[PDB]
């Protein structure tokens, strides 16, 4: 069926970051952190419509043999069903490594690349990712990069089935367990 993604987002200045990580190692599951390092690139298809189609492709540079990942994110639902999280339609697809070449045949062109380097935790269904967004200049190269800002970004995400309430309330409680350190909230993608 059609699965929905619930998002809460925020940010954290880096000099307080470690305390956040220590807080997360208390609250999230009994695991060591994951330290993911990913290359993300955004393709778009300039169809007839006013809205061009958008697709996100991620190659996990750090882990060899990890399948590439496609993600289609639907536009956010204006209905006030879950009032507190970004509720979107998510289609996530594991793929082989010729993907970009295949997408070049489908009519897609690139928009921007960015590295993302950070940590990954989980709590039940929830996925906490705390990462820094790295701008790539010299667009072919993945080493020539610069940090976008001083702050790290924090995302609390749950991918789950369409509708399916009592999900955003648990995300509210897990966000409120961090509220001195981070302010996580449903931020609209407009402006």
């Amino acid at each position: 069926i059609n699965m929905m993604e619930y998002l809460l987002q925020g940010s954290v200045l880096d000099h307080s970051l470690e305390s956040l990580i220590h807080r997360l190692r208390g609250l999230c599951d009994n695991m060591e952190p994951e330290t993911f390092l990913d290359h993300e690139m955004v393709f778009l298809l300039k169809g007839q419509q006013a809205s061009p189609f958008v697709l996100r492709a991620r190659r996990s540079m750090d882990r060899a043999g990890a399948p590439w990942h496609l993600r289609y994110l639907g536009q956010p639902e204006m209905g006030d069903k879950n009032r507190h999280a970004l509720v979107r339609n998510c289609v996530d697809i594991a793929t082989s490594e010729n993907l970009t070449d295949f997408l070049m045949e489908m009519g897609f062109r690139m928009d921007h690349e960015f590295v993302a380097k950070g940590h990954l935790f989980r709590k039940g269904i929830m996925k906490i990712m705390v990462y820094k967004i790295f701008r790539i200049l010299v667009p072919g190269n993945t080493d020539s990069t610069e940090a976008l800002s001083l702050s790290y970004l924090v995302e609390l995400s749950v991918v789950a089935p369409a509708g399916q309430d009592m999900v955003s309330d648990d995300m509210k409680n897990f966000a409120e367990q961090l509220k001195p350190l981070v302010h996580l909230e449903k931020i609209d993608p407009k402006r």
Partner: peptide
């Protein structure tokens, strides 16, 4: 008392990851 998070950084980063503002 000390600030742990800058909200302008939050808006800049979520505008950077939501679409290409600041990357290209």
């Amino acid at each position: 008392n000390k600030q742990t998070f800058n909200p302008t950084d939050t808006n800049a980063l979520v505008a950077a990851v939501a679409f290409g503002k600041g990357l290209s």
